[PDB]
Structure formats: structure tokens, C-alpha cells
Design a protein around this nucleic acid. Sequence first.
RNA 1: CGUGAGGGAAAGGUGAAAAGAACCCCGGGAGGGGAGUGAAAUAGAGCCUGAAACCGUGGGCUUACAAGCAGUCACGGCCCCGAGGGGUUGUGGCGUGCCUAUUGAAGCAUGAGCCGGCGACUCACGGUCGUGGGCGAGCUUAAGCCGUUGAGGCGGAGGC
RNA 2: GUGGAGCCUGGGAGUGAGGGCGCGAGCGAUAACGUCCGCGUCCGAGCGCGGGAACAACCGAGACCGCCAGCUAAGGCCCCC
RNA 3: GGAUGACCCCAGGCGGUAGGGGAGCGUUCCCGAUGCCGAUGAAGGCCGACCCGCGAGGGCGGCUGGAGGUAAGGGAAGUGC
Lengths: 116, 140, 154, 14, 112, 101, 59
Amino acid sequence: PRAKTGVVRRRKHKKILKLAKGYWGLRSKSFRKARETLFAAGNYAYAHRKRRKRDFRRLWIVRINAACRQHGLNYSTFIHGLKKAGIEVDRKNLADLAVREPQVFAELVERAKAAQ
Amino acid sequence: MKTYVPKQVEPRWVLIDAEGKTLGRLATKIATLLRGKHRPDWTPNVAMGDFVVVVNADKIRVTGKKLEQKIYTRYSGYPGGLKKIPLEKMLATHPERVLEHAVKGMLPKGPLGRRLFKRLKVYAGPDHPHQAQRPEKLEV
Amino acid sequence: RGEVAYSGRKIWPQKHTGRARHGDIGAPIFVGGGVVFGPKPRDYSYTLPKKVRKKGLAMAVADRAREGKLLLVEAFAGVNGKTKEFLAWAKEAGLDGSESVLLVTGNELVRRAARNLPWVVTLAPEGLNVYDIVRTERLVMDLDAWEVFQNRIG
Amino acid sequence: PVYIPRPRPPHPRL
Amino acid sequence: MEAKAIARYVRISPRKVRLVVDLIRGKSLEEARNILRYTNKRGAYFVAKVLESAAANAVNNHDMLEDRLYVKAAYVDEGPALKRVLPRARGRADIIKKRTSHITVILGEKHG
Amino acid sequence: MFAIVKTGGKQYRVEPGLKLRVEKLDAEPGATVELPVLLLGGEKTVVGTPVVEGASVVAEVLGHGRGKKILVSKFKAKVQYRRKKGHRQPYTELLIKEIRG
Amino acid sequence: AKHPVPKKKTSKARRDARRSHHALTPPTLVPCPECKAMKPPHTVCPECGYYAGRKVLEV
RNA sequence: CGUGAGGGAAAGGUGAAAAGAACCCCGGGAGGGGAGUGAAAUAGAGCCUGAAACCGUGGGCUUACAAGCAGUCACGGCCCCGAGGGGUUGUGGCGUGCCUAUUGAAGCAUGAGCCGGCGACUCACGGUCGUGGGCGAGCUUAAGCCGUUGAGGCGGAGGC
RNA sequence: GUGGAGCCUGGGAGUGAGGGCGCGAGCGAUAACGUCCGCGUCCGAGCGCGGGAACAACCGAGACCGCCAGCUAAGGCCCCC
RNA sequence: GGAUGACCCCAGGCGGUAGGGGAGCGUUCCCGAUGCCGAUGAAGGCCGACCCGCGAGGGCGGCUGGAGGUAAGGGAAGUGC
Ligand SMILES: [Mg+2]
Ligand SMILES: [Mg+2]
Ligand SMILES: [Mg+2]
Ligand SMILES: [Mg+2]
Ligand SMILES: [Mg+2]
Ligand SMILES: [Mg+2]
Ligand SMILES: [Mg+2]
Ligand SMILES: [Mg+2]
Ligand SMILES: [Mg+2]
Ligand SMILES: [Mg+2]
Ligand SMILES: [Mg+2]
Ligand SMILES: [Mg+2]
Ligand SMILES: [Mg+2]
Ligand SMILES: [Mg+2]
Ligand SMILES: [Mg+2]
Ligand SMILES: [Mg+2]
Ligand SMILES: [Mg+2]
Ligand SMILES: [Mg+2]
Ligand SMILES: [Mg+2]
Ligand SMILES: [Mg+2]
Ligand SMILES: [Mg+2]
Ligand SMILES: [Mg+2]
Ligand SMILES: [Mg+2]
Ligand SMILES: [Mg+2]
Ligand SMILES: [Mg+2]
Ligand SMILES: [Mg+2]
Ligand SMILES: [Mg+2]
Ligand SMILES: [Mg+2]
Ligand SMILES: [Mg+2]
Ligand SMILES: [Mg+2]
Ligand SMILES: [Mg+2]
Ligand SMILES: [Mg+2]
Ligand SMILES: [Mg+2]
Ligand SMILES: [Mg+2]
Ligand SMILES: [Mg+2]
Ligand SMILES: [Mg+2]
Ligand SMILES: [Mg+2]
Ligand SMILES: [Mg+2]
Ligand SMILES: [Mg+2]
Ligand SMILES: [Mg+2]
Ligand SMILES: [Mg+2]
Ligand SMILES: [Mg+2]
Ligand SMILES: [Mg+2]
Ligand SMILES: [Mg+2]
Ligand SMILES: [Mg+2]
Ligand SMILES: [Mg+2]
Ligand SMILES: [Mg+2]
Ligand SMILES: [Mg+2]
Ligand SMILES: [Mg+2]
Ligand SMILES: [Mg+2]
Ligand SMILES: [Mg+2]
Ligand SMILES: [Mg+2]
Ligand SMILES: [Mg+2]
Ligand SMILES: [Mg+2]
Ligand SMILES: [Mg+2]
Ligand SMILES: [Mg+2]
Ligand SMILES: [Mg+2]
Ligand SMILES: [Mg+2]
Ligand SMILES: [Mg+2]
Ligand SMILES: [Mg+2]
Ligand SMILES: [Mg+2]
Ligand SMILES: [Mg+2]
Ligand SMILES: [Mg+2]
Ligand SMILES: [Mg+2]
Ligand SMILES: [Mg+2]
Ligand SMILES: [Mg+2]
Ligand SMILES: [Mg+2]
Ligand SMILES: [Mg+2]
Ligand SMILES: [Mg+2]
Ligand SMILES: [Mg+2]
Ligand SMILES: [Mg+2]
Ligand SMILES: [Mg+2]
Ligand SMILES: [Mg+2]
Ligand SMILES: [Mg+2]
Ligand SMILES: [Mg+2]
Ligand SMILES: [Mg+2]
Ligand SMILES: [Mg+2]
Ligand SMILES: [Mg+2]
Ligand SMILES: [Mg+2]
Ligand SMILES: [Mg+2]
Ligand SMILES: [Mg+2]
Ligand SMILES: [Mg+2]
Ligand SMILES: [Mg+2]
Ligand SMILES: [Mg+2]
Ligand SMILES: [Mg+2]
Ligand SMILES: [Mg+2]
Ligand SMILES: [Mg+2]
Ligand SMILES: [Mg+2]
Ligand SMILES: [Mg+2]
Ligand SMILES: [Mg+2]
Ligand SMILES: [Mg+2]
Ligand SMILES: [Mg+2]
Ligand SMILES: [Mg+2]
Ligand SMILES: [Mg+2]
Ligand SMILES: [Mg+2]
Ligand SMILES: [Mg+2]
Ligand SMILES: [Mg+2]
Ligand SMILES: [Mg+2]
Ligand SMILES: [Mg+2]
Ligand SMILES: [Mg+2]
Ligand SMILES: [Mg+2]
Ligand SMILES: [Mg+2]
Ligand SMILES: [Mg+2]
Ligand SMILES: [Mg+2]
Ligand SMILES: [Mg+2]
Ligand SMILES: [Mg+2]
Ligand SMILES: [Mg+2]
Ligand SMILES: [Mg+2]
Ligand SMILES: [Mg+2]
Ligand SMILES: [Mg+2]
Ligand SMILES: [Mg+2]
Ligand SMILES: [Mg+2]
Ligand SMILES: [Mg+2]
Ligand SMILES: [Mg+2]
Ligand SMILES: [Mg+2]
Ligand SMILES: [Mg+2]
Ligand SMILES: [Mg+2]
Ligand SMILES: [Mg+2]
Ligand SMILES: [Mg+2]
Ligand SMILES: [Mg+2]
Ligand SMILES: [Mg+2]
Ligand SMILES: [Mg+2]
Ligand SMILES: [Mg+2]
Ligand SMILES: [Mg+2]
Ligand SMILES: [Mg+2]
Ligand SMILES: [Mg+2]
Ligand SMILES: [Mg+2]
Ligand SMILES: [Mg+2]
Ligand SMILES: [Mg+2]
Ligand SMILES: [Mg+2]
Ligand SMILES: [Mg+2]
Ligand SMILES: [Mg+2]
Ligand SMILES: [Mg+2]
Ligand SMILES: [Mg+2]
Ligand SMILES: [Mg+2]
Ligand SMILES: [Mg+2]
Ligand SMILES: [Mg+2]
Ligand SMILES: [Mg+2]
Ligand SMILES: [Mg+2]
Ligand SMILES: [Mg+2]
Ligand SMILES: [Mg+2]
Ligand SMILES: [Mg+2]
Ligand SMILES: [Mg+2]
Ligand SMILES: [Mg+2]
Ligand SMILES: [Mg+2]
Ligand SMILES: [Mg+2]
Ligand SMILES: [Mg+2]
Ligand SMILES: [Mg+2]
Ligand SMILES: [Mg+2]
Ligand SMILES: [Mg+2]
Ligand SMILES: [Mg+2]
Ligand SMILES: [Mg+2]
Ligand SMILES: [Mg+2]
Ligand SMILES: [Mg+2]
Ligand SMILES: [Mg+2]
Ligand SMILES: [Mg+2]
Ligand SMILES: [Mg+2]
Ligand SMILES: [Mg+2]
Ligand SMILES: [Mg+2]
Ligand SMILES: [Mg+2]
Ligand SMILES: [Mg+2]
Ligand SMILES: [Mg+2]
Ligand SMILES: [Zn+2]
């Protein structure tokens, strides 16, 4: 019996092209160029899932540093005080507190200043 | 929860007397106000820092033999058109540019950083025309 | 590529034409050219060990007995060739045609009566096989044919 | 196209 | 209520007729007529025929008024190309494409 | 009146009546669990060093789930290395009832 | 010369960007004073043969 | 196509039935618009289905101070669908196509304009392991012969 | 010392163009991104990740998947960052 | 653990080229099939932000299409660009 290609290569090509919607020129129309774009896209996604965690923490640290200087100390002084105070509130929440509850961040500075 | 992202705030104008200040050590502080990194709500992808007005830029100060030896460069694109001008000459001719060049080189390249440069208003001499904005003098 | 009707000419020179090198148009890389490893006539048969098919025949009949699905008949009373004759008989035996039956008998008249029933495979004792036994839900044999099955597995 | 124009000769790199 | 015409297999190059169809899209029938009459382009003759034909369809078949007709839509699709042989030097045959257009014109009634 | 709780190795600010998705907890739906408080704020201010002693965040388990499917793709050039992997992170959905304290 | 050649195929975006200056400008038309028909200025009217106020040719 | 020996294609399908579209309108015609046939006419003869490249019209978002393997991560805006989701992309972060060959390529080394279809580890008989079964000091038949007409049996010559 | 340790019998391979670095030598000119051996290591195949401005083989370290959580490594903390 | 995948618990491994090994998906064809799905719509096509699967894939729904298709379990290859 002969098994000719038939519907397979076309359905396989559509799976790719549908994933490539939004791409530029042939990168969304040409199955080959779509696939090449998706190799790079899939590695970028993996890589930026890793980088997102560092992006946001680095932002958080900046916002914390700024609220600290208003109370007289720099970030590296503040973090050390919380370690010595035993306070374990993380940087995602120190940042939300720095901006949404400056009276709670305020005392958090005092507990840090007083723990050295 | 998501990390807070600030709604558009009206910015704050500031004012600095550059008399007898050290060019590079003032530029980092101006660069920071322009980035807004002194604000607990700092956000990297928006222009939300301070409007910074500087005066007495003619009286900026600089250590070592930099007046004779520091050279600013400009290349026109033409054969031989690398122009070299020393700080001495620049302060004698366009003193607003000494600071302007130092802060511009300490801002991020790309669209947003280019907008931040537009928010810096350096003048020579002790007077500025922005009284309408009622700027808040700083001490740096 | 050598059984194909085309010529063995090189279609264009090996070099300096700006095209791919090619030989004749019967190469399987060409549309209309040869087939690389397509089928050729084959002999799928093989000598399965006699003991193994002797045992399988014995085992298959045993299976239908172990479900109480095998029936020996002494003879087929009023069955003289007519279908409705064999049906009538099938009634008085509990073979109402909701189960597939392998009818095994040397009686030419009886096989002829049942050949057309969709639920009946018919068979001479000399042809008792395991495919037809397993193909069907219950078995029915001459006591004459049961003797023939008892010989072939001795 | 059964007629192929012959290629130009290469620049002699000897 | 709309009225359409299609000139199919006009032996003209689509890209060429489109320039002419671009002068008339969204014009009234009177403006599209005056425009087409003094356009210095082969494709104007073919467009005029489709325009008038669609307008006749509007008046005759679809109970529309000649005074309120405008070109609501108009476009030039490409049809099968005529392939012809152009002989070149050193014995080569170039294949000229004598292209083909399907010309469509759709008219509405501009109320007011 | 908010609390900063810890669950799943991540910290969350939660107020009474806040639906939240945390890592998957081992509790039948409908049932109630208590979360550890690292900070109370809003009307008073209580700073845990690290965990506040009396405090507790009451949470009701609405259900468990699988998030939308991240495609985890891996490619290495010139080496015919390709890997495709579909990931759906399991989660638990809590409704913050009350901040004990 | 040495037979210059397009190094790359021109994208749909670049092809059409070049045609950004290819639209026809519609013909300059003015109504004819005599018969009120639209016609290009400074030509004898082809619907009544009137120019400069007088009949100039048969139509 | 080749002087010639010789080479050597492409090209199938309306519909159940031609009922294959009278007649009218624009038009030189071609084509179309109505009418009519049909269960169906984007089944209208350039006819079943009708993919993709490719070309076009319309709509949403977007763009004329901007540096780019074209994506990805984040946030914001606008449009759409109804504590969410889809489309688009302004800014910020990060980011050296695919294949091949190579000690080493994004590589200014190779192949590829793009799309669709064709396209490359098989069969025979012998061998050597392994393996699922049968039989076991035994195991096994070949060619033929008989029977069936998708029925199986016989045949010990011979081989291990 | 229980380790993707070792030994024995057998089935299937691929490889038999290596390269940089450290150290030991020879050749070279106490030249080469030079050449040829030895010990080791990385790239090869980890052109995945952090640092080194950028950069296979230098320093850090062996990426099963997810997280808007925490600690560090080299290297860093005036601004770009 | 229970008693030989019947699921659970604890711990450890899981970068990878040449290459070895394992388990799967899908295509055409045969048995299953004188069956069963089918004009209250076959295969094929076009969507889908929905369901299952690590994946290859499989469903389900809407549009198209108009006459075929084919299960659990096995069998054989012109089997995936
Ligand atoms: Mg094939
Ligand atoms: Mg897009
Ligand atoms: Mg895009
Ligand atoms: Mg495109
Ligand atoms: Mg384009
Ligand atoms: Mg696409
Ligand atoms: Mg596109
Ligand atoms: Mg396209
Ligand atoms: Mg990740
Ligand atoms: Mg980290
Ligand atoms: Mg800061
Ligand atoms: Mg510390
Ligand atoms: Mg800490
Ligand atoms: Mg607020
Ligand atoms: Mg200063
Ligand atoms: Mg900003
Ligand atoms: Mg000096
Ligand atoms: Mg041949
Ligand atoms: Mg031949
Ligand atoms: Mg031949
Ligand atoms: Mg012949
Ligand atoms: Mg011939
Ligand atoms: Mg020959
Ligand atoms: Mg020949
Ligand atoms: Mg060649
Ligand atoms: Mg050649
Ligand atoms: Mg070429
Ligand atoms: Mg070729
Ligand atoms: Mg070629
Ligand atoms: Mg050749
Ligand atoms: Mg060939
Ligand atoms: Mg050939
Ligand atoms: Mg040959
Ligand atoms: Mg053939
Ligand atoms: Mg042929
Ligand atoms: Mg072959
Ligand atoms: Mg065989
Ligand atoms: Mg029959
Ligand atoms: Mg029968
Ligand atoms: Mg039967
Ligand atoms: Mg040729
Ligand atoms: Mg040539
Ligand atoms: Mg004109
Ligand atoms: Mg009319
Ligand atoms: Mg010529
Ligand atoms: Mg010519
Ligand atoms: Mg050509
Ligand atoms: Mg052409
Ligand atoms: Mg054409
Ligand atoms: Mg989660
Ligand atoms: Mg990924
Ligand atoms: Mg990938
Ligand atoms: Mg790699
Ligand atoms: Mg590549
Ligand atoms: Mg790469
Ligand atoms: Mg390599
Ligand atoms: Mg690869
Ligand atoms: Mg590869
Ligand atoms: Mg590849
Ligand atoms: Mg996977
Ligand atoms: Mg010349
Ligand atoms: Mg020349
Ligand atoms: Mg010349
Ligand atoms: Mg010239
Ligand atoms: Mg030329
Ligand atoms: Mg376009
Ligand atoms: Mg252009
Ligand atoms: Mg032009
Ligand atoms: Mg134009
Ligand atoms: Mg006038
Ligand atoms: Mg001739
Ligand atoms: Mg002749
Ligand atoms: Mg037909
Ligand atoms: Mg017919
Ligand atoms: Mg019919
Ligand atoms: Mg007929
Ligand atoms: Mg007429
Ligand atoms: Mg006609
Ligand atoms: Mg018409
Ligand atoms: Mg008609
Ligand atoms: Mg019907
Ligand atoms: Mg249709
Ligand atoms: Mg149809
Ligand atoms: Mg039909
Ligand atoms: Mg059709
Ligand atoms: Mg068509
Ligand atoms: Mg179509
Ligand atoms: Mg458009
Ligand atoms: Mg500018
Ligand atoms: Mg702009
Ligand atoms: Mg780039
Ligand atoms: Mg961000
Ligand atoms: Mg949204
Ligand atoms: Mg968005
Ligand atoms: Mg971007
Ligand atoms: Mg590839
Ligand atoms: Mg090579
Ligand atoms: Mg080479
Ligand atoms: Mg390049
Ligand atoms: Mg290249
Ligand atoms: Mg290049
Ligand atoms: Mg070359
Ligand atoms: Mg080569
Ligand atoms: Mg190649
Ligand atoms: Mg070519
Ligand atoms: Mg293309
Ligand atoms: Mg192809
Ligand atoms: Mg083989
Ligand atoms: Mg073969
Ligand atoms: Mg064998
Ligand atoms: Mg064997
Ligand atoms: Mg046996
Ligand atoms: Mg035994
Ligand atoms: Mg025997
Ligand atoms: Mg090992
Ligand atoms: Mg080992
Ligand atoms: Mg093997
Ligand atoms: Mg093996
Ligand atoms: Mg070898
Ligand atoms: Mg050798
Ligand atoms: Mg060697
Ligand atoms: Mg060597
Ligand atoms: Mg060596
Ligand atoms: Mg070397
Ligand atoms: Mg060395
Ligand atoms: Mg040393
Ligand atoms: Mg030596
Ligand atoms: Mg180096
Ligand atoms: Mg050396
Ligand atoms: Mg040496
Ligand atoms: Mg070595
Ligand atoms: Mg290699
Ligand atoms: Mg490494
Ligand atoms: Mg290694
Ligand atoms: Mg690398
Ligand atoms: Mg590289
Ligand atoms: Mg590195
Ligand atoms: Mg680096
Ligand atoms: Mg490097
Ligand atoms: Mg590396
Ligand atoms: Mg690992
Ligand atoms: Mg730390
Ligand atoms: Mg250190
Ligand atoms: Mg910093
Ligand atoms: Mg293992
Ligand atoms: Mg592995
Ligand atoms: Mg399968
Ligand atoms: Mg077939
Ligand atoms: Mg079977
Ligand atoms: Mg059948
Ligand atoms: Mg039915
Ligand atoms: Mg019907
Ligand atoms: Mg339907
Ligand atoms: Mg099928
Ligand atoms: Mg089929
Ligand atoms: Mg599906
Ligand atoms: Mg369908
Ligand atoms: Mg039929
Ligand atoms: Mg089947
Ligand atoms: Mg099967
Ligand atoms: Mg076969
Ligand atoms: Mg094949
Ligand atoms: Zn006139």
C-alpha cells in the first residue's frame, strides 16, 4: 500500500503559522520563516521568565532605596537593620509598603535604625 | 498582588546654583533627579522625574588641569572634520554646554532618556526665565 | 529507475549550466521517475510448524467447549437442501441466528442449505481451521466430522 | 531551454 | 440598496487600471463621469464602461435614482495571465505576462 | 486593616474579602486554613520579627486549579536540538475571610 | 560594467512605499460658460465648440 | 525538439436530470445586472471540493527625532468580547537568522525568492545475536500430491 | 569507599581533521592566533546562564518545569547600571 | 507502604554533538465488518480565547462541504521534509 503525504504536512504547517500570528512580513506568512522566528521566540520566553524575577526585584530595590533616603539612610543600611531586627518582609512587599503605607515603612525604618 | 504602577503625576520643578560646584559630581545628582530615582514610585518606562533648572553654570568648577587639557570633540562627517575644543574655550563661548554635555552623557540612550534631557534647563548667569513655574531651590 | 520508460541520456551537462547536476529523468528525484524502495511481488507464506497448527486446532475447539458453545449433532433431520429446511432445524436446536455459527459437516446437502445465512460460515471437516472457529461464536459438527477432528489432532 | 549560454571565462588568478 | 458591475477578463494590467479606479472611488456618478472623460489613460475607457453599466443596473433593476448615485466601492482584481514568448539575445526566451483584470464598481444612493 | 502573609514561599498583602491564588495547598475545598502573619497594618501597626505570635489570617479554600498553559521551548542551533514542553502551574484559590491578630 | 543585480527581494512594504508618489492627479476641469459642461480650461469646448465667447468649430 | 538514429510531454470530474439560463437592461463585443432552472448557481460550463504562496477592497489598533535576526518580558493607551480574555503597540529590559560544514560562523564560508505537491536506510536469500512461542535426544520437512476456491492436509527425500 | 562504581560474556555503535588555556620540554628567534610530545583543564558537545564593554575554551558555575519569594559566586556599589 | 502498575509516601538522578537504548503519536492498507457512524450531513476545507495529553497529537463546537467513513484489539508498509 502507498501512504502519500496528504493532509499531514499542511496541518503541521498550519500549527506553526497559527503560532506565528502577528509576526512581520513572511515571519507570519511563510511556514519556514515562521518556524525560525519561533525558535528564537521560545528561547527568549524561557530566558525572560528567568529575567522577570530579576527585573522586578531590581525595581523593588530602587523604590526601597528611594523611600529609605527620605528617612536618612541608604538601602544597604536598611536591609542590614531588618536582618538584625529579624524582620523578613520581602522586597516585593517592602516596595508596596514604601509607596502605599509610608507610615508603616516609616516604623520599618525605625526598627532598622534601632537594630544596628 | 501586582507591583504598583503610578498614575500620571504632575512633575516638580527644582533649581540649583552651580557656582563652585564640581562639574561631574553635580551631573550625577542632576541625572538622578531627571530619572526620578529619588521617588519611591520610580518607574523605568515613563518620564516622571523632576524638571531641573540650573543657574550660574558659568561658575562651574573643575579640578586638575582640565581647563587646558579636557577636550570636547565633534565630527562633521566630512574628511578631516574632527573638531577639538578645550573646556576653557567652551566656558568662554557656550558655558551652558559644559554641564549640558556632562548630564546628557549620564542619561540613558534611547527615546525616554532623550526626553529627560529636554527637562533640564541650564543657564549661564544667576537668572532664569522660569518664574512662572515657581521652582523649588535645592541644596545639593 | 531502470524499469521506467525514459532514456538514459544526461539531460544537460554536468558543469557550468547554473542548474543542479542530473542524469536521466528516471532518477527517483524526478517527478515521473522511478520509485526507490517500492513493493515488488512477494510470497507472504511461511511453513508454520505442523505441531503448532495441530495444537491450535485442538485448542480452538477446546475454547468453545470451555464456554459451553460447542454442539455435536447426530444428523440434520429434515434438511434436504432448502434454506428454510435448515432454519427450521436451527430452531429446534437453539440456533436462532443471533450468534455466528460454524457449520462443520460432510453433508453436501446441509452445507448448501446454510451457506446463505449471514450468521453461518459453512465448512467441510477437512477444512476445520482456527481462524473460522475463532471468527464465530459457537461451533456445530457432524458426529462424522467430530471423528475427523479427533483424527487430525491425534 | 536546451541551449545554455556558455559561461564567461574566469579572471586568470595565477 | 446597491448596484454592481464587473468587467471580467479585460486584457489590461491590473496595476495600471487601479490608478484610474483610484480617481473615482467615493465620487458621485457625475464627477466620476467628468473625471473619466479627461483622464489620459487607456484604463479610463474600460472603467467608464463598467461605471455606466453599473449605473444602468441601478436605474433599471434596483429602483435607484440616477441623481443620487455615487461610487460606494470599486476595486480591480487580477485574472489569469496570458503567457507569451519574448525572444532575447544569445538564444533565450523570456516569458512575457499579458496580465488580466476583473473590474468591479459598486454604486449606492447618497441620501441628501 | 491588611496583613502580609507567607504561603508557598511567597509573601502577599491581603485584606478581608480578597480572592487570591497561591501555590497549591493540601486542603479540601470549602475548608478553612490559617496563614502566618508577618505584618499587620492599617489601623494599628504590628511588626513581626519575623512571625507575629497571636496573629492569623483566616482563609477559605474555594478550589484548586491549573493555570493557562505556558509553552516551554528549547532550541540549540546547528545541532538539531529542539524540545517542546507544555507547563500548567497548579494553584489554589483562597478567599480572605478575616485577619485574626 | 559587471551586470549589477538586486541583492535582496524588495519587501511588500518597500515596494509599495516607493509607489507612495504614484497616484493620478485628477484632471483640471472648469464648466463651459455656454453649455455648462465640465471641460479643461483653455481648450475649445468639445460639447459646443465655443471659446472666448464665440463658436469656433462644429461638434 | 532533432539532418537523422532518436528524444518525448502536458491535459480527468457541472448537475439527480441540461432543467446548459427564454426574455429585458448597460455594452461594439467580451463581460455583467435582472428574470428563470435547480435541493444547492462564489454547482454557470474559465463549472465538485477549492488549501498555500501571491494580488486587492473595507474596518480596528498603530507609525513622519527614529538604530533594526524584527522577537521576547513588563507596564501603560486604544479598539473588541463578556476580578477575565482577544487584537494592536507607545516606552523600558534583554537579544549575533536557519541549515550545512568545521578546532571554531551572526558570520563577509555552503544551500535556500516564496508556496504547494514528489523526494532518500528496503526487499530477497543466506548468516549472527537477541527475543515470543512449539517440540525436545530429538526438531523440521523441500519439490510435489490431494482438498478448498481467502480450508487445510499429506509428503521424511533431505537439513540441523 | 554502594558509586550512571568495578569485573565477566555477548548485541549496536560512533571516533581515528581537534582547539584554546596552565605547567613541563623539544623545534622556532628565551617570534607567531607557530609547530610537536607529556600532565591537567575547558570548548568541542555547556556559541545555555553571571562576570570580563563587546568575544567557544580567562574568572564564577554544570540550565527537568513554574513563582512579581530568599542567600550567595566571580565581579561589583558616582551617573549610564 | 499494597502485595508483582492498583495508587501513595520519602529520598536521589534528570546540560548535551557523533552515537547506543526505551516508550509513544500520526499516515496508507487488512482483519474486526453481511457489523457500526452517516443527507437530522461522510471525508476534505476554514475558524476556535474551549477540553485531554510532557509532546507528537486527540477531542469538542461553529462555518464550509456534499458521500462517504470506520471502533476497542491486532496485522502489514511506497509511513511524517
Ligand atoms: Mg512523502
Ligand atoms: Mg503584531
Ligand atoms: Mg510582533
Ligand atoms: Mg505579513
Ligand atoms: Mg510586509
Ligand atoms: Mg500567521
Ligand atoms: Mg502578515
Ligand atoms: Mg500571506
Ligand atoms: Mg524560566
Ligand atoms: Mg536569581
Ligand atoms: Mg531608588
Ligand atoms: Mg545581609
Ligand atoms: Mg533579609
Ligand atoms: Mg496611592
Ligand atoms: Mg555637587
Ligand atoms: Mg521615569
Ligand atoms: Mg585646569
Ligand atoms: Mg534511471
Ligand atoms: Mg534506463
Ligand atoms: Mg527505459
Ligand atoms: Mg521509449
Ligand atoms: Mg522514448
Ligand atoms: Mg542508458
Ligand atoms: Mg542514452
Ligand atoms: Mg555541477
Ligand atoms: Mg559545477
Ligand atoms: Mg542561480
Ligand atoms: Mg535546478
Ligand atoms: Mg538554480
Ligand atoms: Mg547535469
Ligand atoms: Mg537527478
Ligand atoms: Mg539524473
Ligand atoms: Mg550514475
Ligand atoms: Mg511513473
Ligand atoms: Mg508522465
Ligand atoms: Mg533504490
Ligand atoms: Mg520475512
Ligand atoms: Mg454466502
Ligand atoms: Mg454465509
Ligand atoms: Mg459471520
Ligand atoms: Mg538548463
Ligand atoms: Mg549563465
Ligand atoms: Mg490626466
Ligand atoms: Mg442611465
Ligand atoms: Mg534583442
Ligand atoms: Mg529583445
Ligand atoms: Mg524568469
Ligand atoms: Mg513574466
Ligand atoms: Mg494577470
Ligand atoms: Mg501561582
Ligand atoms: Mg519557552
Ligand atoms: Mg525554542
Ligand atoms: Mg547552543
Ligand atoms: Mg542557526
Ligand atoms: Mg545562536
Ligand atoms: Mg558546533
Ligand atoms: Mg537544531
Ligand atoms: Mg541543526
Ligand atoms: Mg536546525
Ligand atoms: Mg515536553
Ligand atoms: Mg563599465
Ligand atoms: Mg567592466
Ligand atoms: Mg563595455
Ligand atoms: Mg554605470
Ligand atoms: Mg547589465
Ligand atoms: Mg500591503
Ligand atoms: Mg522602496
Ligand atoms: Mg517608480
Ligand atoms: Mg499616491
Ligand atoms: Mg468656467
Ligand atoms: Mg526541425
Ligand atoms: Mg522534423
Ligand atoms: Mg458531474
Ligand atoms: Mg456527469
Ligand atoms: Mg443527488
Ligand atoms: Mg450529459
Ligand atoms: Mg444596445
Ligand atoms: Mg452576455
Ligand atoms: Mg453589469
Ligand atoms: Mg447574465
Ligand atoms: Mg436539504
Ligand atoms: Mg461555497
Ligand atoms: Mg458547490
Ligand atoms: Mg458530485
Ligand atoms: Mg470551484
Ligand atoms: Mg477560484
Ligand atoms: Mg478563495
Ligand atoms: Mg487596507
Ligand atoms: Mg535630537
Ligand atoms: Mg513622535
Ligand atoms: Mg539588534
Ligand atoms: Mg517594569
Ligand atoms: Mg485586557
Ligand atoms: Mg498589552
Ligand atoms: Mg520593544
Ligand atoms: Mg530548521
Ligand atoms: Mg566545507
Ligand atoms: Mg572549511
Ligand atoms: Mg548577518
Ligand atoms: Mg551566508
Ligand atoms: Mg550576510
Ligand atoms: Mg566562498
Ligand atoms: Mg566547502
Ligand atoms: Mg549546504
Ligand atoms: Mg532559481
Ligand atoms: Mg513570498
Ligand atoms: Mg515543500
Ligand atoms: Mg537497515
Ligand atoms: Mg525493495
Ligand atoms: Mg535475523
Ligand atoms: Mg529466532
Ligand atoms: Mg512444534
Ligand atoms: Mg519446554
Ligand atoms: Mg516433521
Ligand atoms: Mg555514566
Ligand atoms: Mg558507565
Ligand atoms: Mg542498533
Ligand atoms: Mg542495540
Ligand atoms: Mg569514522
Ligand atoms: Mg586516519
Ligand atoms: Mg590524527
Ligand atoms: Mg595533531
Ligand atoms: Mg595532539
Ligand atoms: Mg593552532
Ligand atoms: Mg598556551
Ligand atoms: Mg603562575
Ligand atoms: Mg623534549
Ligand atoms: Mg583570545
Ligand atoms: Mg604559544
Ligand atoms: Mg611555545
Ligand atoms: Mg588539551
Ligand atoms: Mg565536530
Ligand atoms: Mg563553561
Ligand atoms: Mg564538560
Ligand atoms: Mg559561547
Ligand atoms: Mg559568537
Ligand atoms: Mg561569557
Ligand atoms: Mg559577556
Ligand atoms: Mg570570550
Ligand atoms: Mg560559554
Ligand atoms: Mg543539571
Ligand atoms: Mg543579600
Ligand atoms: Mg567578593
Ligand atoms: Mg545605581
Ligand atoms: Mg537515573
Ligand atoms: Mg538528556
Ligand atoms: Mg500509530
Ligand atoms: Mg489509496
Ligand atoms: Mg486479525
Ligand atoms: Mg467487510
Ligand atoms: Mg442511523
Ligand atoms: Mg437532505
Ligand atoms: Mg451542515
Ligand atoms: Mg481519515
Ligand atoms: Mg481516506
Ligand atoms: Mg484538533
Ligand atoms: Mg467537517
Ligand atoms: Mg457509496
Ligand atoms: Mg480500519
Ligand atoms: Mg491499530
Ligand atoms: Mg505489503
Ligand atoms: Mg518513499
Ligand atoms: Zn460648451
